[PDB]
Write a protein that binds this ligand. Structure first.
Ligand SMILES: O[C@]1(c2ccc(-c3ccccc3)cc2)CN2CCC1CC2
Length: 284
């Protein structure tokens, strides 16, 4: 085990802990590709959690300066300000892959903004947020998951990211509400006559279910479009990306099965993930 192995194993630990689904799928990649995914994923996770370290932007600005160091001097030795292990691994990735740094910076700006969170007026703003927080992650992963990147590769990977985020939102309505977040748009909440606080207090009803299903059908159509364009990705990543996605699409059924509850986080059992992999592994 080298020092660099240790940095990657740490990145792996961050990804497994926070997402058993993506870990389950992406750990099936060939060794150099999965390690690159762990490092990008861990960086993104550190960005998402940065504000809560002290309670302000300090740690986030240090991550950003780390990433800028890597971009400007990819082969120089850096004394990293934030998480050294993760930044050494990201730097190692960047020496082998064309990383879209502006995509990390977009993610970072979305985090800064999310400090003065106000609800989205319209769905267009919600979809902007899904880009910021998750389409950006798809962009950064693109060179890892595909042999030759075109605008279409980025477009697909970006749409996949945003569709996964929409599914997250639909899974976490109640938990987000507790943390003073609602991600459904004001336009759409008014249209369907739905008040999240009221639903959190009194349970689901037909209006909420219609609103929830409105968004679920968006996520599902987007997912179908990604699946139909799966060939943009490397041959080894295709089944894995299909699995990651299918596991996530299954979250929607878990929600309906639990009657759209706002008081627990539903999940797709590990044994179910393995069933979907069998279904897919056959096709490939
Ligand atoms: O977990 C994030 C994420 C979302 C989407 C993809 C993705 C994965 C594969 C392809 C495209 C995107 C990765 C990570 C990272 N972070 C901000 C948003 C969510 C929650 C915390």
């Amino acid at each position: 085990m080298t020092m660099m192995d240790m940095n990657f194993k740490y990145c792996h630990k961050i990804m497994k802990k926070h997402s058993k689904s993506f870990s389950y799928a992406f750990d099936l990649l060939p060794e150099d590709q999965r390690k690159a995914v762990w490092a990008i994923y861990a960086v993104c996770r550190k960005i998402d959690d940065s504000i809560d370290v002290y309670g302000d932007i300090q740690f986030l600005n240090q991550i950003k300066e780390d990433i800028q160091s890597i971009e400007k001097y990819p082969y120089e030795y850096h004394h990293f300000q934030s998480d050294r292990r993760i930044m050494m691994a990201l730097q190692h990735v960047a020496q082998h892959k064309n990383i879209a740094f502006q995509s990390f910076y977009n993610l970072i700006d979305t985090v800064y903004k999310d400090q003065h969170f106000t609800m989205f007026e319209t769905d267009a703003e919600l979809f902007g947020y899904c880009y910021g927080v998750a389409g950006t992650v798809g962009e950064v992963l693109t060179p890892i998951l595909s042999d030759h990147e075109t605008h279409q590769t980025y477009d697909v990977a970006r749409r996949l990211g945003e569709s996964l985020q929409l599914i997250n939102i639909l899974r976490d309505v109640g938990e987000d509400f507790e943390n003073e977040r609602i991600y459904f748009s004001k336009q759409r909440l008014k249209q369907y006559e739905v008040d999240i606080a009221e639903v959190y207090q009194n349970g689901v009803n037909n209006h909420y279910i219609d609103l929830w299903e409105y968004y679920a059908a968006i996520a599902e159509k987007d997912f179908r479009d990604v699946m139909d364009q799966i060939k943009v990705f490397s041959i080894e990543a295709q089944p894995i990306i299909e699995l990651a996605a299918r596991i996530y699409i299954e979250i929607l059924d878990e929600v309906r099965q639990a009657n759209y509850t706002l008081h627990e986080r539903v999940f797709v059992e590990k044994r179910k993930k393995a069933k979907l992999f069998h279904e897919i592994n056959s096709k490939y």
